[PDB]
Amino acid sequence: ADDYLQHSIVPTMHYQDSLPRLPIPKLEDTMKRYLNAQKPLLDDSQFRRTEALCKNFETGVGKELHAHLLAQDKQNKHTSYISGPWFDMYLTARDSIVLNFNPFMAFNPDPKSEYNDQLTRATNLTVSAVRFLKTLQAGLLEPEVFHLNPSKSDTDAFKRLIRFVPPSLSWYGAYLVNAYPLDMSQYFRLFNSTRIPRPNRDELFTDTKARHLLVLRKGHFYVFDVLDQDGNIVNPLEIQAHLKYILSDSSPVPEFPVAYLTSENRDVWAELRQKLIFDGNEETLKKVDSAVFCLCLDDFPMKDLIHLSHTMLHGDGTNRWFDKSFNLIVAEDGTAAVHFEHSWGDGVAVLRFFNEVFRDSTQTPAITPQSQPAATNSSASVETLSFNLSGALKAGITAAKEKFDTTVKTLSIDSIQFQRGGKEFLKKKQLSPDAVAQLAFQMAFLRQYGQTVATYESCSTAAFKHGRTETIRPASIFTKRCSEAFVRDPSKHSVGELQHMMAECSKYHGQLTKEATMGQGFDRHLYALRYLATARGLNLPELYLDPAYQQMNHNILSTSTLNSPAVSLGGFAPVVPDGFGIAYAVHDDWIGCNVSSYSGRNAREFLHCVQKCLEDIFDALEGKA
Ligand SMILES: CCCCCCCCCCCC
Ligand SMILES: CCCCCCCCCCCC
Ligand SMILES: CCCCCCCCCCCC
């Protein structure tokens, strides 16, 4: 009977005070792991040079920087050694946030066809989102926890007990039942938050007192309350009425859509924002910045999955406020997705938000397709924001548009649905499903371009206090050896030989996966040492000036998996001009991939090869040659 979509018996933040600290690897282990990852990428001569640099680093400056890093960590046990430096890196970056960083996740349709009406779904998705906001702020959202055995740890029985254990010892309680609570310090930024462009480093802004929603349609800005001053969610039928009002607006797109500015270089946008304020738009900008989130209503249907990906990843530049913590998008055909700003968090908060909202809006919708909009004066409740644009601002919007169109025109995206099998078949073959997907990417790249390249796979270290992410390096001596066998020398190898090579890839990949989740990767450690060197005003150590290091950090193959019943498709642009941005998901009986590329690479051809490699892998696993 309330506005909460969850009623946790355990306070949302119950485990935060007792989360284990993010460990720092021993310098000896990091150097060894760094070298292991370089083995498949460097030729003998390059490797020798790099190995020598590592030896020197470990005994010289590296040893010194590591000591300082440990000393610093001890003085800040309330956080992690990597969180601050990581935020600093992204807030300082001056590149456009569109494509370079902002990703998207698209919702599956409501199982009930009729409920996918734009007005209906925009209303239900919006109401569920505010219900999430209320639930989170009330501490009634179930604590984020990773269960190894849900049937024993994620039960009311355990909940009734841990609930009495003090926050200072709660983590241990879950630990005993093989449950791992996660960090939730970023979750508050899901709402009333935005990224503000500033001269050298951007700032993350949040106004927890704001109660209005920002809606974008045909480039126009609208705001209206979704939470009243009493703290209750505005009547769903009234919200429906205001959205119907917005959807009825016949005003044409503005000649100069202001939203384009959020896609600019950060220094350029920072200055243009200053002028916007100098020209009297501060009040308007404050309304935009503080809205609970941004709801975008596109006036067109999705033509194909490719069109959907483009629409949710970047759109046409006029109807998305890229700086907002997130943009909830709902197209004419009801297709919905969440486009979010990268810098404020690691996206776990967004996924949780995403799953809860999908569940709540499809299982307990606020309104139905037959619901009657409540009587109300929408023209009074809904304010159309206006921007006083000077000649310099219009020129600025024009330039932003040309820069946007120029970049977007080079982006290509496509997907595949491998339906011969998934987790079930692979697990029976006693192989890691994730390791197999990664092996396929390596094999496809070798077949398409004839080389082994720097590969990145995202992993979470959210099991630790202020944990963030760590890098899993799937390109190994094993995947290289295996790919060469499948691609170069087929036949010359027996099916048995191919099977054991894949087993070797899977085993090593599992090792790297566990180490990464435990903060035992080498990337964050090496980055933190470099960040500290720079902070100390010290010269960049030769280890980092090594071409091998730069190459290890030019991730041609960027990947991240996403597993969720609420997610239909997801994606992100490549992180380097000649790279691929690979979002994939291994399901029980099939495998899906959504791949992006710029002019330099061919996503469509790559996927063809990925399909081919997955078929070859499945054949070999079935005893076929
Ligand atoms: C101990 C490992 C916990 C991992 C928790 C799930 C992380 C999912 C990240 C999703 C990012 C979109
Ligand atoms: C949201 C999907 C992210 C996939 C992984 C991208 C990793 C890029 C790291 C770049 C470091 C310089
Ligand atoms: C059936 C709905 C569309 C599925 C398209 C294939 C999967 C694309 C990759 C998803 C990665 C999260």
What is the DSSP track for 511-580?
A: HHHHHHHTT--SHHHHHHHHHHHHHTTPPPPHHHHSHHHHHHTS-SEEEEE---TTEEEEE---SSTT-E
CATH code of the domain in which 165 resides? 1.20.1280.180
Q: Is 431 annotated as a binding residue?
A: yes
Report H helices in 299-347: 305-313
Tokens at residue 620, please? 């070999």
CA-closest residue to ligand 3 atom 11: 584
Distance CA(448)–CA(440), nearest Å, equals: 12
Report H helices in 200-315: 236-248, 266-278, 282-290, 305-313
Does the residue 5 lie in any domain?
Answer: no
Which residue's entry shows tokens 């969850």? 6
Which residue among 417, 562, 587 is best mutated to probe the pocket of ligand 3, counting the most ligand atoms within 8 A of its Cβ?
417
Which helix (H) or strand (E) covers residue 449, if one does? Answer: helix 433-449
DSSP helix, strand, coil percent of the chain (3-state; round to 5): 45, 15, 40
CATH code of the domain in which 247 resides? 3.30.559.70
Q: Looking at ligand 2, which atom is closest to the CA of residue 560?
A: 4
Domain check: are 292 and 431 in the same one? Answer: no
**Which residues lie below 8 Å from residue 81, measured CB to CB, with a gap of 6+?**
22, 24, 69, 72, 73, 528
Q: Residue 450: which region, alpha, beta or left (left: phi > 0; alpha: psi -120 to 50)?
A: left
Domain check: are 193 and 168 in the same one? Answer: no
What is the domain count for the chain?
A: 3
**Which residues lie below 8 Å from residue 6, measured CB to CB, with a gap of 6+?**
135, 140, 141, 142, 356
Domain check: are 580 and 598 in the same one? Answer: yes
How far apart are the CA of 558 and the centre of ligand 3, in A?
17
How far apart are the CA of 562 and the centre of ligand 2, in A?
14
Which helix (H) or strand (E) covers residue 484, if one does? Answer: helix 477-487
The two beta strands, 455-460 and 336-340, are: unpaired
3-state SS, residue 253: coil
Domain check: are 203 and 109 in the same one? Answer: yes
The Cβ of residue 100 has, within 10 Å, a number of other Cβ atoms equal to: 14
Q: Which amino acid is at 44?
A: D
The Cβ of residue 285 has, within 10 Å, a number of other Cβ atoms equal to: 17
User: DSSP secondary-structure letter at 166?
Assistant: -
Q: Is 26 annotated as a binding residue?
A: no
Task: Specify whether the CB–CB gap between 442 and 455 falls below 8 A.
Answer: yes
How far apart are the CA of 44 and the centre of ligand 2, in A?
28
Domain check: are 355 and 474 in the same one? Answer: no
How far apart are the CA of 467 and the centre of ligand 2, in A?
16
User: Experimentally, how was this structure solved?
Assistant: X-ray
Q: Is 433 annotated as a binding residue?
A: yes
Q: What are the Cα distances from residue 52, in Å, to 29, 31, 56, 477?
A: 16, 11, 6, 20
Q: Is 334 annotated as a binding residue?
A: no
CA-closest residue to ligand 1 atom 4: 460
Q: Which of 67, 73, 62 is nearest to 30 (CA)?
A: 62
Does the residue 314 lie in any domain?
Answer: yes
How far apart are the CA of 567 and the centre of ligand 3, in A?
8
User: Residue 210: what are its φ and ψ, rounded to 5°?
Assistant: -65, 145
Active-site residues, by number, are: 342
How far apart are the CA of 350 and the centre of ligand 1, in A?
11
Does the residue 298 lie in any domain?
Answer: yes
Task: Specify whether the CB–CB gap between 378 and 247 falls below 8 A.
Answer: no
Does the residue 535 lie in any domain?
Answer: yes
Half-sphere exposure of 119 (CA within 13 A, CB side): 20
CA-closest residue to ligand 3 atom 6: 592
CATH code of the domain in which 546 resides? 3.30.559.10
Domain check: are 304 and 361 in the same one? Answer: yes
Domain check: are 372 and 452 in the same one? Answer: no
Q: Is 353 annotated as a binding residue?
A: no
Tokens at residue 189, please? 């930024």
Does the residue 30 lie in any domain?
Answer: yes
Distance CA(503)–CA(507), nearest Å, equals: 6
The Cβ of residue 249 has, within 10 Å, a number of other Cβ atoms equal to: 14
Tokens at residue 35, please? 């070298």
User: Residue 344: what are its φ and ψ, rounded to 5°?
Assistant: -75, -20
CA-closest residue to ligand 2 atom 6: 558
Q: Sheet holding 412-418: strands in order across?
A: 412-418, 591-597, 580-586, 557-561, 455-460, 469-472
CA-closest residue to ligand 2 atom 11: 553
The dihedral over CA atoms of 344, 347, 353, 354, expressed in degrees to the nearest 10, equals 130
Half-sphere exposure of 8 (CA within 13 A, CB side): 21
Nearest ligand to the C-alpha atom of residue 468: 1
Query: In this structure, is the dihedral angle defined by the CA atoms of residues 481, 486, 489 and 490, taken in order, positive or negative?
Result: positive
3-state SS, residue 402: helix
Residues with CB under 6 A from ligand 2: 103, 456, 458, 553, 555, 558, 560, 572, 575
Report H helices in 163-265: 170-176, 236-248
* Biggest CA-to-CA distance, the chain: 77
Q: Looking at ligand 3, which atom is closest to the CA of residue 105?
A: 12
The angle that helices 477-487 and 603-621 make with each other, rounded to 10 degrees, is: 90
Domain check: are 421 and 288 in the same one? Answer: no
Task: Specify whether the CB–CB gap between 582 and 441 falls below 8 A.
Answer: yes
Q: Is 164 annotated as a binding residue?
A: no
The Cβ of residue 341 has, within 10 Å, a number of other Cβ atoms equal to: 26
Distance CA(467)–CA(184), nearest Å, equals: 9
Does the residue 592 lie in any domain?
Answer: yes
Q: Kindly state if the Cβ of 415 falls inside 6 Å of ligand 3.
A: yes
Task: Specify whether the CB–CB gap between 240 and 119 falls below 8 A.
Answer: yes
Q: Which amino acid is at 448?
A: Q
Q: Which of 516, 488, 514, 482 is nearest to 500 (CA)?
A: 482
Q: Looking at ligand 3, which atom is closest to the CA of residue 417?
A: 6
The two beta strands, 193-196 and 220-225, are: unpaired
Nearest ligand to the C-alpha atom of residue 351: 1
Q: Kindly state if the Cβ of 581 falls inside 6 Å of ligand 3.
A: no
Domain check: are 308 and 450 in the same one? Answer: no
Name where the chain breaks: residue before each gap, C-N > 2.5 Å: none
Task: Specify whether the CB–CB gap between 461 and 519 falls below 8 A.
Answer: yes
Q: Which of 388, 367, 342, 306 is nearest to 569 (CA)?
A: 306
Distance CA(86)–CA(93), nearest Å, equals: 11
CA-closest residue to ligand 3 atom 1: 568
3-state SS, residue 239: helix
Task: Specify whether the CB–CB gap between 579 and 558 falls below 8 A.
Answer: yes
Q: Looking at ligand 1, which atom is closest to the CA of residue 351?
A: 12
Q: What are the Cα distances from residue 395, in Å, to 219, 316, 538?
A: 17, 18, 42
Domain check: are 425 and 515 in the same one? Answer: yes
Q: Is 434 annotated as a binding residue?
A: yes
Nearest ligand to the C-alpha atom of residue 341: 2
Tokens at residue 5, please? 């979509």
Task: Specify whether the CB–CB gap between 179 and 145 falls below 8 A.
Answer: yes
**Which residues lie below 8 Å from residue 334, measured CB to CB, with a gap of 6+?**
109, 110, 115, 116, 117, 118, 120, 121
Does the residue 602 lie in any domain?
Answer: yes
Domain check: are 303 and 395 in the same one? Answer: yes
3-state SS, residue 600: coil
User: 400 is in which domain, residue-wise?
Assistant: 101-142+182-411+565-574
Does the residue 351 lie in any domain?
Answer: yes
Domain check: are 120 and 265 in the same one? Answer: yes
How far apart are the CA of 57 and the centre of ligand 3, in A?
44
Q: Which amino acid is at 91?
A: L
Task: Specify whether the CB–CB gap between 412 and 606 falls below 8 A.
Answer: no
With 0-12 / 13-18 / 19 or more C-beta atoms within 10 angstroms meaning exposed / middle / buried, residue 610 is buried
Distance CA(72)–CA(361), nearest Å, equals: 46
Number of H helices, E strands in the chain: 23, 18
Distance CA(222)–CA(220), nearest Å, equals: 7
